[PDB]
Amino acid sequence: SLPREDTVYIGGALWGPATTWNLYAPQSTWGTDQFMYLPAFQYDLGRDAWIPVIAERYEFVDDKTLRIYIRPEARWSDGVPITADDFVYALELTKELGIGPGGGWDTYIEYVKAVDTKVVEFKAKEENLNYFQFLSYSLGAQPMPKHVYERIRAQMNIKDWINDKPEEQVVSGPYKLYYYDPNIVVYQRVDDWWGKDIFGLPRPKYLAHVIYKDNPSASLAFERGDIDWNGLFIPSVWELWEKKGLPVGTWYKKEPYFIPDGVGFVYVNNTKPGLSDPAVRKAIAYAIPYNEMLKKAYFGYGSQAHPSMVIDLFEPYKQYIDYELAKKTFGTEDGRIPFDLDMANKILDEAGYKKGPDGVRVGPDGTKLGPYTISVPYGWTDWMMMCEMIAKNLRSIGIDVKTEFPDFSVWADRMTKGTFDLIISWSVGPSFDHPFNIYRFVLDKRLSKPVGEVTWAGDWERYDNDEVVELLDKAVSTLDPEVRKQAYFRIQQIIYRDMPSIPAFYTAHWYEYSTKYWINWPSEDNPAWFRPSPWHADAWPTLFIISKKSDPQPVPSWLGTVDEGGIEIPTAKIFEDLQKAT
Template sequence: MVNRVVKSKLVEVITFIAVVLMIASPFYVVQSQYVPREDTVFIIGVEWGTVRSMNPYTGNPTTLWGHAYLPLFTYSALKDVWIPTLAERYEFVDPYTLRIYIRAEAKWSDGKPITAYDVEYTYFVTQQVGVGPGAGCQDYLEYIKAVGDKVVETKMKEPPRNYYSFLSCSLNFWPLPKHVIQPIFEKEGKDGITKWDNADPATQVVSGAYKIYYFSPTDRIILVRLDDWWGKNIFGVPGPKYIAHLLYADNAAANAALEAGDADWAGTFIPEVWKLQAKGIYTWYKSAPYYVGAGVNFLYLNLKRPEFQNPAVRKAIAYALPYKDMLEKAYFGYSPQATGVGVNDLVEAYKKYLSSDLCTKYGLTPDCRFETNIAKAKQILQEAGIDPSKISIEIATPSGWSDWNMMAAMMAEALRAVGFDASAPTPDFTVWWDSLTKGTYSAVIGWDGGIGFDHPWGVYRYVLDPRLSFPSGNWEGYTNTEVIQYIDAIPQLMAEPEKQLSLILKVQEIFLRDLPAIPLFYGAHWYAYNTKYWVGWPSQDNPWWWPTAPWDTQSWPIPFGLVKAGQTPKAPEWIDKLAVPTSKIVSDLAKAGAPVPVTVTVTQTVPTTVTAAPQTVTQTVPTTVTQTVGVATVTMVSTSTVPTTVVSTVTAAPQTVTQTVTEWTTTIVLAVVLFIIGFVVSWFIKIKRK
């Protein structure tokens, strides 16, 4: 009888424990997911489908790793300046050799010093693996090596003597802790280092002010602030204690979270964003164009096709396009028309690269734009003896890219008015991308290499260099080798700006003469913020940092300027205090001694038909595709739809909202096991009773 009572009680206890575990699981099993809303910056637009790891050796890490790992120097495109970050200064040993001095205070989060040997070994592993910090830099650097505990030395490769890539690879290098990655690489090799997830909060070692707090590939990533990080006396401590990114099914769901106040920082396309200002959501500008334009988006015509090899056809198309209408209606006024020579004139520092005389010589407006002129388009074709009705143009854009889809449809309509057989298909992204890799497309809207301190050289190399092919550049298949000498010489003349400008204008003349691609607009740098919980965001009225989307690794300074709503924000003083203008670096380079003179053979080429040799390129396209060419990095993010359940719990305490997602798997399994045990014990008791 006693045994029966004991066993019966045991069943009750086990059942009670199972129920308690089921109820308490949000706080017991996943307590690490609990983050107070008022202490957290929630971001959208970085991760889609699956949360990527913080391992740069995968070749496709989450860009949130930029908040945990810092570079030697950080570049700001807004003011064209460099911020000494892990490093405190640089020194040119000679025109080809640079030394970078790491801060004495710089330490990893485990207390070990950050040294030049970390930089050296990080680059070594990158060279072995083929991806990671400094990938591609071997084409421009002889070496990156430690010449002291805190001194890194880099040497430029000659040829090609590319100062843009040399400086970018040297200054903007992101080291990892040698004492962490060396044991993995030496024991497990390439396979081990590429599979390292770097997501364990207990073992992760970082150089920045944040580290992993919670990581789930199918759910979210949360970073937590390190209040005692090494840089607090130089850079201070960021305002938000946590940075969190939840997975959303699609762009619309992510934007809905921003509008509802469940997200604070967005890197997504938002239709009619001005309507959200009433809810405290803003962009860089409070009026059109709202966003800062970055790289140039082009209409790329496939020059492998005979119908597009005559420059007259391309110029007629350029004059037919409805730039103003499509940018206002399809792009919501988020960008003005781009200059016809690919120079981003929204940035004051770049206007010096424009020549009104050159532009008007080739039929553009004095501010270097193509005007929409259907009559002129017809005239160009008539004078060239070309019948547009015999030319088929399919302007393909990926399905679901609503802004591009509408632009393509409007362009096709305008081209039909000229007489072309034009259409605007919208294939799935993978089909669209595959047509580019195989060279089977007719025409597409596409991007360039973005803007940076190498502008506009970066644009011209990406669009014109016949040595490149998709996806690295030269989408259209331009084959004029005349331009190579200028593309190679421009980076060598960084310390001689007048000579450099003369070559840039020569490239522009070739571009206007041949018009291998048609500049359309500046791709908006998606940056929006919600002021419900956090204030101090950079903006046109508060331009302490440039409008970086959360998916940009150079965005790490933004949390340092944020404070909770109701408090008075203060822009970080260290940015202006530490900033080194690119012009200062150029001046220091010139003082280091004159490099070997650059010889450029100027050839006069009569306009000819441009023919491209067929090429086949095989490319596997993941959700995010990143291609690095020199210093230009292009990141294209496609949206995947993955059902996600998000549970929001609102706590009664004022100003406190808890966002949690319950991981039921472990709890359910445990409960089921306990239930089975209880059932078996109960059954056993019944048998005994019989």
């Protein structure tokens, strides 16, 4: 019963049921992090700059001490000021509970301290000084409402709290929950949002997400005009406007249609017998039919990933790849891993795996290579097809793998708790600290948890290597790019030796829009925000950029770097200030 012209309908972001609106719970509902809880500074990948959001300003006291000045206007939706205590509390709670925003901060941050009501100070750890992580955890810090969470902690386990009462929801963002049921989640704009005199208001009054069971049903809704903002895999997407003449668009009008999101992996659980052998993981890498699955399953919307984990779609990242090592190791022109079942079988043969009567390999200890599952969420039809193609090839070489596609919530539980065998999942994307970010997320045991315990922070596969930890600790102890590069090069040697999990393809930043009710969507022709996908962590500025068709507004004046006429601080300026404070 929502007003259509004041509602943005969304697809491809929420899969399975609503769970909670609590970032410390094992699962929370799409929209919670994106729109309800904002950071100190919002990183802008498109401009390589930082929007001062809850923060007004930063200051380096020295190269290891960063003060963040909170806007006087920054205020929770219940009227309580956002204070330095809220920043300290959020991070200390994440450390205590082993889950929540800012996971891992305490590895590279010595302290977070409320030096005044509106001033928070972060101090870098010097033992393993890491300037990227220092900046990431400090500038990107997300406060959480201490006064709310302490009340909850007195009543119950914070992990059990649903936070599902609209009137009582205490948020820092411009939206909060309005309504939900088994078929929809709806958010409503906070009209007296604290940021209204700095950022304006987002244009939609409501954000609604009907819960579709699969891609085909979501696609049908999109074709009917019932989804405005979509983050969906869509086969033959160009035909929506070329053949069907629908008022629909993507970032690119021509192929590949989508900008890149990150790196999709075949994650292989290192804790399971058989899968714990690097030889088996290497064999799996050679048995993935990269080219065929990316054409048939992925419609050419993304290409094969480089095994270094570096996103070589961007020229400036190519310096971080030891191409000679990759070429030497894999025998291909660029060092990508070839699809080669002969090689996969050879690897298993040379590791002492012999096929038994049923055709399944048994190791020299003799661990049987199966039964295993490969799993992705039901309805994610592109990934499901990839899984089927991969599983069949693995069965061919004597690894007993079958597909299993449970509801998203169940899949996510098994991934985060590390009870899976194989899955396809995401990792990280292009960023100011790439490829440090992907090595940290995928390879760092410190971000993992025991099997049975939830981690959203990293290392789902439970890879355990102490040399990687040492290399991550030294990679950015100075800003000399050569030190970083050599750390990355050695990590790459370790990746090829251990095959902790398999970088497979560059994931698409799924993003489609309808112009029927909402206009000025970011695109190649209007590149106002480079992370517009409705499920992306950094989606929120999109909602300030779009207008109602019947009420067009100008571009928000705060957008753009300081030199361009907005309020965004270039990453280069932050590093300039850091070096100057040394």
